[PDB]
């Protein structure tokens, strides 16, 4: 009966369902050799399913159309639009480039999914809530503590701000991307690019891990609920693969909900198989999380008032959403759609897109830099990877409606390859790095502007040279203030077999203050001051 009920023909026409191949035959060792190169060298931009970069996707319909020789030449010489040259540079051999061309003509191999069973299997409560201290069992000045990422070591070091000494090094997931604080200021949350999250109790005799869990195969962001009456309630994390985000117990990390970001794009409104989750930021206006979904250019407002029945408001922005942060008032999310060269303004109160501001080539603000301009009122700034400009955008609809969501002015730095711009309420300086600048000297130093005289050109602080480290690229990255706002820290991100350091500068004088060296300080990248991260002070 039920077999006759569901027994008619599918409305889908067999003639339009296509079998995939006609690709160059390659053995198992040849396919694995190419596959290994693809995730080590290509995937980052192009993605798992090869639809992550601008331009045409590397799926068999397009690649077989181009042909073996077209592909080999394209991989060999690259393009001026963001596709590196692998043959000319001499990175890959002609035998490898040949394998790569044949490889992308085959259906993309499939990485495993990662749901609730996998999540729970990896979930570990190391110290039960009840077995945790009721008070701070140490003498540490937690607010002024710095959570520094020792990238290649798969660890993080807690550095005491005033003493400049490493208080504790902790094993974490590989290459931790960011550190975030719980609203109470007690727990420290870190997540590795391997999607493994680690919750750390700063009140323990020695700050230690109390729980851990893996939320995907690849990830970048984590965050805690910051709405009033929700301290340490929920923790969210966004993954690159699978395309999803997960919500967990903010006290134990127990997985509760998992949502897929696979969907329709904002621009063409077509289906995208891999919309990776970028930045995530907690709302202060409503009990919701603001999630950035890259490839589809959507900003989702995930309400956690009722975790059992999840309500999500999908706001369209612009393609390629990445990093971003609050305006001075903590109401408007200033996030960059890098490859679209725009900054999306999300109103967290009224819950809508306030504007799409045209900025420079490939905006990369991190969380951005907020400061009051002598003429244009309160602005939010961002530097770029594509060029040497710095965009100042008005963020005061109330008192400065004429300058709101407008690129009010522009500043010029040392050049492109910039990654982070920084300032502080108590500071009158504006720092900007240039980490990926092709020039060694430029990439090994930072620019500083005088907020009291913006017409004047920037000064150049020789960070890497001050560290006195010897050989290596010595790339300087991310300025970060201490709780007081009179010290600015920088990482001298050198190789793993080289010597790296953390340089500190007296903000009041712009003079070298201290240098943090230690054999354990391996490949330091992101630094997050506890109080400043927790209270979004930027």
Site residues for ligand DHE per CB under 6 A? 5-6, 8, 44, 151, 175, 177-178, 193, 220-221, 278-280, 322-323, 366-367, 477-478, 525-526
Does residue 16 belong to the site contacting a copy of itself (CB under 8 A)? yes
Residue 330 binds what, of a copy of itself, ligand HEC, ligand DHE, none (CB under 5 to 8 Å, by partner type)? none
What residue 58 binds from ligand DHE, ligand HEC, a copy of itself, none (CB within 5 to 8 A, per partner kind)? ligand HEC
Q: Which does 367 bind (CB under 5 to 8 A by kind): ligand DHE, a copy of itself, ligand HEC, none?
A: ligand DHE
Q: What minimum distance in Å lies between the beta carbon of 94 and ligand DHE?
A: 27
What is the Cα–Cα distance from 391 to 357, expressed in whole angstroms?
Answer: 10
Cβ closer to ligand DHE: 284 or 406? 284
> How many CA atoms lie less than 13 Å away from 514 in the CB half-sphere?
15
Tell me whether residue 53 or residue 502 sits nearer to ligand HEC (CB atom). Answer: 53
Rule CB under 8 A: choose which of 20, 208, 402, 459 binds a copy of itself. 20
Catalytic residue among 106, 272, 322, 429: 322
Contact set for ligand HEC, span 370-389 (CB under 6 A): none
Q: In the complex, what is the shortest distance from the CB of residue 326 to ligand DHE, in angstroms, rounded to a whole number? A: 11
Beta-ladder partners of 446: 461
Cα dist from 480 to 52, 186, 395, 488, whole Å? 31, 20, 23, 5
* Distance of closest approach, residue 179 Cβ to ligand DHE, in angstroms: 9
Compare residues 53 and 317 and give the one whose CB is closer to ligand HEC.
53
Catalytic residue among 46, 106, 384, 429: 46
Contact 194, 214 (CB under 8 A): yes
Instruction: Work out whether 77 is an interface residue with a copy of itself (CB under 8 A).
Output: no
Asked whether position 495 contacts a copy of itself by CB under 8 A, the answer is no
> At which residue do the structure tokens 């009010």 appear?
408
Q: How far is the CB of 279 from ligand DHE (least distance, A)?
A: 4
Query: Which two structure tokens, joined as six digits, stand for 324?
Result: 């971003």
Q: Does 424 participate in catalysis according to the annotation?
A: no
Distance CA 145, CA 168 (A): 11
Strand order in the sheet with 459-461: 421-422, 429-432, 446-450, 459-461
Please answer whether residues 395 and 402 qualify as being in contact, where contact means their C-beta atoms are separated by less than 8 angstroms: no
What does the angle CA 269 – CA 272 – CA 276 come to, to the nearest 5 degrees? 120
- Nearest CA to 356 out of 368, 372, 377, 340 is that of 340
Alpha-carbon torsion 167, 171, 174, 176, what sign? negative
Catalytic residue among 106, 119, 181, 364: 364
Residues 429-448 that bind a copy of itself (CB under 8 A): 436-438
Which span (51-59, 238-246, 371-379, 397-405) binds ligand HEC, by CB under 6 A?
A: 51-59
Active site residue 429: no
Q: Is residue 69 at the binding interface for a copy of itself, with CB under 8 A as the rule?
A: no
Q: How far is CA 504 from CA 366, 407, 475, 529, in A?
A: 20, 32, 15, 13
Residues 29-48 close enough to bind ligand HEC by CB under 6 A? 37, 41-42, 44-46
Which residue of the set 16, 26, 83, 284 is catalytic? 83
Q: Furthest-apart CA pair in the chain: how many Å?
A: 85
- Residue 278 contacts which entry, a copy of itself, ligand HEC, ligand DHE, none (Cβ below 5-8 A, type-dependent): ligand DHE
- Which residues in 59-88 contact ligand HEC (CB under 6 A)? 62, 66, 71, 74-75, 79, 81-84, 86
Say how far apart CA 202 and CA 342 lie, in whole Å. 38
123, 456, 478 from 486: Cα distances, Å? 40, 22, 16
Calpha distance 523→472 (Å, rounded): 11
Cβ atoms of 381 and 360 closer than 8 Å? no
**Number of residues in contact with a copy of itself under rule CB under 8 A:** 88
Residue 255's DSSP bridge partners are 248
CA separation for the pair 485, 504 (Å, rounded): 12
Q: How far is the CB of 101 from ligand HEC (least distance, A)?
A: 7
Q: Which residues pair with 432 in a beta bridge?
A: 421, 447
- The distance from CA 415 to its chain's CA centroid, rounded to whole angstroms, is 22
Tokens of 260: 């897929």
As annotated, the binding site for heme c includes 42, 45-46, 66, 79, 83
Q: Which does 66 bind (CB under 5 to 8 A by kind): ligand HEC, a copy of itself, ligand DHE, none?
A: ligand HEC
Indicate which single residue of 56, 120, 205, 305 sits in contact with ligand HEC (rule: CB under 6 A).
56
Active site residue 535: no
* 8 A C-beta contact, residue 180 and residue 222: yes
Active site residues: 42, 45-46, 83, 322, 364
List residues near ligand HEC by CB under 6 A.
3, 6-7, 37, 41-42, 44-46, 53-56, 58, 62, 66, 71, 74-75, 79, 81-84, 86, 100, 104
């Amino acid at each position: 009966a039920a077999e006759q009920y569901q027994g008619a023909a599918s409305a889908v026409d067999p003639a339009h369902v296509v079998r995939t191949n006609g690709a160059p035959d390659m053995s198992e060792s040849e396919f694995n050799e190419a596959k290994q190169i693809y995730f080590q060298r290509c995937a980052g931009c192009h993605g798992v399913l090869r639809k992550g970069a601008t331009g045409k996707p590397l799926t068999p319909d397009i690649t077989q159309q181009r042909g073996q020789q077209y592909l080999e030449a394209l991989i060999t010489y690259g393009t001026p639009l963001g596709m590196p040259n692998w043959g000319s540079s001499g990175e890959l051999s002609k035998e490898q480039i040949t394998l790569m061309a044949k490889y992308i003509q085959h259906t993309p191999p499939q990485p495993p999914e990662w749901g609730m069973p996998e999540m729970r299997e990896s979930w570990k409560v190391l110290v039960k809530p009840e077995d945790r201290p009721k008070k701070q069992l140490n003498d540490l000045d937690l607010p002024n503590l710095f959570s520094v990422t020792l990238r290649d070591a798969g660890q993080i070091a807690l550095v005491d701000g005033d003493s400049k000494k490493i208080v504790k090094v902790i094993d974490t997931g590989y290459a931790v991307h960011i550190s975030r604080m719980s609203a109470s200021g007690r727990y420290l949350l870190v997540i590795g690019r391997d999607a493994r999250i680690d919750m750390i109790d700063l009140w323990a005799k020695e700050p230690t891990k109390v729980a851990e869990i893996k939320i995907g195969i690849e990830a970048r962001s984590v965050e805690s609920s910051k709405f009033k009456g929700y301290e340490d309630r929920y923790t969210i994390a966004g993954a690159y693969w699978p395309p999803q985000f997960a919500i967990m117990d903010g006290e134990t990390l127990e997985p509760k909900q998992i949502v897929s970001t696979r969907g329709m794009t904002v621009d063409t409104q077509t289906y995208h198989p891999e919309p990776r989750v970028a930045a995530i930021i907690a709302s202060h206006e409503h009990p919701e999380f603001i999630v950035n979904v890259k490839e589809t250019g959507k900003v989702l407002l995930v309400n956690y008032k009722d975790i059992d029945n999840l309500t999500v408001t999908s706001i369209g922005a612009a393609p390629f959403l990445h990093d971003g942060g609050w305006d001075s008032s903590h109401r408007y999310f200033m996030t960059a759609a890098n490859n679209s060269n725009k900054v999306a303004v999300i109103d967290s109160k009224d819950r809508r897109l306030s504007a799409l501001v045209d900025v420079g080539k490939t905006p990369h603000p991190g969380r951005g830099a907020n400061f009051v301009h002598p003429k244009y009122g309160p602005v939010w700034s961002t530097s770029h990877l594509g060029d040497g400009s710095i965009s100042l955008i008005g963020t005061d609809p109330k008192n400065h409606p004429q300058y709101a969501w407008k690129k009010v002015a522009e500043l010029q730095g040392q050049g492109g390859g910039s990654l982070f711009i920084k300032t502080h309420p108590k500071s009158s300086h504006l720092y900007v790095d240039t980490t990926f600048n092709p020039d060694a000297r430029i990439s090994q130093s930072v620019a500083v502007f005088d907020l009291k005289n913006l017409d004047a050109k920037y000064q150049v602080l020789p960070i890497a040279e001050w560290a006195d480290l010897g050989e290596g690229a010595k790339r300087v990255v991310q300025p970060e203030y201490n709780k007081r706002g009179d010290e600015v820290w920088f990482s001298v991100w050198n190789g793993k077999n080289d010597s790296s350091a953390l340089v500190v500068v007296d903000d009041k004088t712009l003079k070298l203050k201290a240098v943090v060296k230690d054999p354990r300080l391996i490949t330091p990248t992101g630094k997050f001051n506890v109080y400043n991260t927790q209270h979004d002070v930027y």
